[PDB]
Amino acid sequence: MKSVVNDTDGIVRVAESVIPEIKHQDEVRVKIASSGLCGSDLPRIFKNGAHYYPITLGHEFSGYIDAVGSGVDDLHPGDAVACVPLLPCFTCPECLKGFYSQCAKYDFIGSRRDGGFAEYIVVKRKNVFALPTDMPIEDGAFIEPITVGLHAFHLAQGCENKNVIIIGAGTIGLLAIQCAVALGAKSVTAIDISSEKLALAKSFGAMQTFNSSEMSAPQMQSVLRELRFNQLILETAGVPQTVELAVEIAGPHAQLALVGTLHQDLHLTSATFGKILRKELTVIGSWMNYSSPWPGQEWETASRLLTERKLSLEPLIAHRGSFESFAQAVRDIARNAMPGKVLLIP
Amino acid sequence: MKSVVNDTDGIVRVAESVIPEIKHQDEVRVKIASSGLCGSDLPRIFKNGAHYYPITLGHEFSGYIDAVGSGVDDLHPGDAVACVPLLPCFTCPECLKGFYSQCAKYDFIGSRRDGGFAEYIVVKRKNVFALPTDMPIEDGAFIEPITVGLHAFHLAQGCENKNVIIIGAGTIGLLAIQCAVALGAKSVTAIDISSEKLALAKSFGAMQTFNSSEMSAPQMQSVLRELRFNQLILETAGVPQTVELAVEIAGPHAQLALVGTLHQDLHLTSATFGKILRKELTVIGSWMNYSSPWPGQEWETASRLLTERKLSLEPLIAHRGSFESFAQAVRDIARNAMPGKVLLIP
Numbered sequence: 001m002k003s004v005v006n007d008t009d010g011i012v013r014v015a016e017s018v019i020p021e022i023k024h025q026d027e028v029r030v031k032i033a034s035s036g037l038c039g040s041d042l043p044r045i046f047k048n049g050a051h052y053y054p055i056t057l058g059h060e061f062s063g064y065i066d067a068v069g070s071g072v073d074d075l076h077p078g079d080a081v082a083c084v085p086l087l088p089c090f091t092c093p094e095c096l097k098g099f100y101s102q103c104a105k106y107d108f109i110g111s112r113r114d115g116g117f118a119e120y121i122v123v124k125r126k127n128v129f130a131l132p133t134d135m136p137i138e139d140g141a142f143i144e145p146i147t148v149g150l151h152a153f154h155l156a157q158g159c160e161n162k163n164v165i166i167i168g169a170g171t172i173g174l175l176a177i178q179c180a181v182a183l184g185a186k187s188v189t190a191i192d193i194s195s196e197k198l199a200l201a202k203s204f205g206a207m208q209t210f211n212s213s214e215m216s217a218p219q220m221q222s223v224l225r226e227l228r229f230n231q232l233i234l235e236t237a238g239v240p241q242t243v244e245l246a247v248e249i250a251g252p253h254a255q256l257a258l259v260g261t262l263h264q265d266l267h268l269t270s271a272t273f274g275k276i277l278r279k280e281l282t283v284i285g286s287w288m289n290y291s292s293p294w295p296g297q298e299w300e301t302a303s304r305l306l307t308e309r310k311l312s313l314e315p316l317i318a319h320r321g322s323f324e325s326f327a328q329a330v331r332d333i334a335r336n337a338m339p340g341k342v343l344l345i346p
Numbered sequence: 347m348k349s350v351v352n353d354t355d356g357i358v359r360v361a362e363s364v365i366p367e368i369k370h371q372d373e374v375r376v377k378i379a380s381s382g383l384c385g386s387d388l389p390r391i392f393k394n395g396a397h398y399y400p401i402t403l404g405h406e407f408s409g410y411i412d413a414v415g416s417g418v419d420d421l422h423p424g425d426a427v428a429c430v431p432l433l434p435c436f437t438c439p440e441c442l443k444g445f446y447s448q449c450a451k452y453d454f455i456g457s458r459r460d461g462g463f464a465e466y467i468v469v470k471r472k473n474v475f476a477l478p479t480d481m482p483i484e485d486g487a488f489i490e491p492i493t494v495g496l497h498a499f500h501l502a503q504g505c506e507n508k509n510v511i512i513i514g515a516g517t518i519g520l521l522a523i524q525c526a527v528a529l530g531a532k533s534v535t536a537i538d539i540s541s542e543k544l545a546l547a548k549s550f551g552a553m554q555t556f557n558s559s560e561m562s563a564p565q566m567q568s569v570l571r572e573l574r575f576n577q578l579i580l581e582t583a584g585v586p587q588t589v590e591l592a593v594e595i596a597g598p599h600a601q602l603a604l605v606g607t608l609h610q611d612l613h614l615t616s617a618t619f620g621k622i623l624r625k626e627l628t629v630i631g632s633w634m635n636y637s638s639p640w641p642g643q644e645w646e647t648a649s650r651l652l653t654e655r656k657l658s659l660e661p662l663i664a665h666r667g668s669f670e671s672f673a674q675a676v677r678d679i680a681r682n683a684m685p686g687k688v689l690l691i692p
């Protein structure tokens with residue numbers, strides 16, 4: 001079988017290996033149908049940011065059950081699933097509190113173990129999430145990235161009647177816009193360094209967009225004056241400038257959910273830091289996308305919003321291809337901006 | 347009358363001026379009995395931190411009503427009061443929502459206007475808070491700093507049954523320790539560079555202390571393992587190193603309340619920033635100490651805790667003196683650490 005394997009210093013290869021076998025009663029094998037590249041994968045591929053090399057990435061995927069372990073009674077060959085890539089230990093104090101993303105001993109498909117850029121994969125039963133039978137299987141690869149935004153909304157106690165601001169118009173951000181609209185946000189504003197996805201953002205329901213390469217924070221704050229209360233700002237870009245921006249534009253008692261992980265240091269002036277206090281912001285760290293009961297309401301919500309046609313995935317997709325096509329698309333990224341969702345379609 | 351007036355390049359003078367007159371029907375004049383120096387005043391004096399110079403500081407004070415304006419019907423000459431130093435406009439959208447500390451046009455006694463390092467001051471009726479008749483007048487000068495900690499607890503939805511960590515053993519911090527104990531915290535831990543102040547913290551009920559000049563963050567986090575859940579951390583020191591320390595030591599889903607204003611920039615590593623997300627911290631900016639109904643439950647609680655003998659003020663006090671003595675004590679501090687509460691007793 002084929003897979004995409006990344007090695008040190010940005011080399012991408014398509015490799016051949018044996019189909020993995022089920023080794024435990026609680027495992028299943030998935031024949032992968034659709035598998036997406038995450039923004040978080042770019043540092044793993046090009047910036048020697050993976051836990052090990054060689055590695056096969058991929059934690060945003062769907063497919064059909066090919067086989068099940070003898071202890072699996074609620075799934076059958078042919079069933080459609082999405083991958084739930086985190087595997088908590090389920091027995092430490094954090095896990096028993098439902099703090100799965102704080103498990104000290106968790107596995108992660110496509111980061112801590114090999115993942116879904118492959119024709120087949122073997123995972124635990126608890127690492128798959130059954131899809132509605134009428135859901136196009138390709139759509140299943142988007143459930144995991146949908147739940148990222150949903151998890152942040154959940155930590156913020158919802159987005160209903162809030163003035164939502166999404167910073168970063170990558171896939172996670174664009175999905176978050178769609179979810180905010182569907183979940184009853186009063187308004188949604190989208191902010192990004194480029195202007196391309198911003199028209200797209202408006203098509204997804206953002207009522208306005210700010211190009212941060214063309215507007216300063218005070219200019220944005222001025223436009224936001226009427227919408228300054230009950231803000232929920234999601235920082236999805238994961239760069240110092242956008243974390244700073246979020247604090248600078250925030251209205252009184254805004255909630256600021258941090259979704260994007262930084263790869264450079266954050267220097268805040270005393271002035272900017274002071275605004276966190278003066279505005280009495282609530283800054284909410286968000287990590288992964290799970291809650292109790294496992295894998296969490298985020299996953300059910302994502303599935304439901306999709307089935308209800310409240311989300312639109314097609315415009316998000318920049319590339320569809322099998323292994324060679326996908327590998328070259330990944331290579332073509334180098335480390336510039338992500339064009340859109342690059343899908344591997346085995 | 348005398349007052350303490352500080353000037354550019356850190357000069358502290360004792361000045362003579364005319365007693366202020368009541369000019370409006372809703373003003374009162376207070377003859378000041380006890381007036382404290384805040385940690386926040388040191389940058390105003392020795393670091394070009396004030397809004398203007400020359401300036402008379404002082405926002406932690408008590409005294410007796412000397413005279414009232416024709417429109418004041420509920421206060422009388424001889425009444426004991428503490429100063430409520432913030433004056434919001436009460437007519438902007440922030441104020442109408444009870445967000446007084448985000449008022450777009452607020453005054454502040456001892457920062458934006460001259461304050462209580464003086465024999466007499468004229469303020470609005472809304473700027474005084476009546477004390478119980480049996481409360482020792484000097485105790486009144488501590489109500490405002492008590493409400494600082496209480497306001498942070500309030501924003502965090504209380505400290506009851508929580509594992510409270512107070513970072514900074516200055517007056518604000520030590521008072522917050524006492525309040526946390528009185529309000530039913532599960533545990534209280536104090537962190538500071540001073541073994542002195544930390545012994546005091548233990549005497550106030552802190553079950554353990556960490557000397558940050560001797561212990562590293564990992565060492566502290568190791569000790570905190572048993573108490574890592576349901577943490578509420580108050581950062582009261584207002585220096586970059588203690589904000590960093592707070593994130594580094596925090597347990598899973600800890601609440602971090604930021605009380606201390608920075609007068610230096612904050613440089614967080616990408617790793618430290620990452621911990622905000624990975625631990626799913628909630629970082630709560632806390633600003634001043636007010637809520638609806640004006641001036642807020644914080645003030646009632648402060649008064650009550652004092653009357654109920656749940657707080658201990660004497661050990662907090664490092665100096666009592668009239669104007670020359672007080673002024674020299676302030677000069678002796680410079681940009682060294684605060685010894686404890688320095689009181690002006692006119």
Ligand SMILES: [Zn+2]
Nearest residue numbers: 038040059145
């Ligand atoms: Zn991801």
Ligand SMILES: [Zn+2]
Nearest residue numbers: 089092095103
């Ligand atoms: Zn665990």
Ligand SMILES: [Zn+2]
Nearest residue numbers: 384386405491
């Ligand atoms: Zn103060």
Ligand SMILES: [Zn+2]
Nearest residue numbers: 435438441449
């Ligand atoms: Zn106002």
Ligand SMILES: [Zn+2]
Nearest residue numbers: 266267612613
């Ligand atoms: Zn720096």
